[PDB]
Amino acid sequence: AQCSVDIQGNDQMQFNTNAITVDKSCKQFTVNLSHPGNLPKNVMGHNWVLSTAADMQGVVTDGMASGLDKDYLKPDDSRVIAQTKLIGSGEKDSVTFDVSKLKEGEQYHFFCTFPGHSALMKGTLTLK
Ligand SMILES: [Cu+2]
DSSP states (O other), X not given: OOOEEEEEBOTTSOBXXXXXXXXXXXXXXXXXXXXXXXOOHHHHOXXXXXXXXXXXXXHHHHHHHHOGGGTTSOTTOTTOSEEOOOBOTTEEEEEEEEGGGSOTTOOXXXXXXXXXXXXXXXXXXXXX
C-alpha cells in the first residue's frame, strides 16, 4: 500500500495536485514537496500545510502576519496538523504525520501560506 505522495509547487504558483487521499490503513503518511523553478524563496517560496477546512483561512491569515522570517506560519500553530518548511526553487521538503490525527467525519484542506498563494495553491485531503 502507498502511504506517501509527491507534490510539486512551481514558479506559476501551482501545486501539481489539488486533491490528496490517504489510505486509512497507513499508520503514517508522507508528503514529499518539491519546488522546481528558478525564483528564490522570498519571491515564490512554497510550503504544504494541512488543517481542517474551517481552520484554513485562519491558518493562512496568521501565517502571513507571521512573516517571511517564520516561513509564513504561526509557530506551533495548533490548527496545523502537518506542515513542510517553506522552500524556494531547487529545494525539497517532506513531512510525515500520523494518520491517527485525521478524523473520520472532518473535512481537511492543504494549502501554501506564502502571501497570496492560497488562492491557487489549495486542495482537499481525504481518508479513503
Ligand atoms: Cu506557495
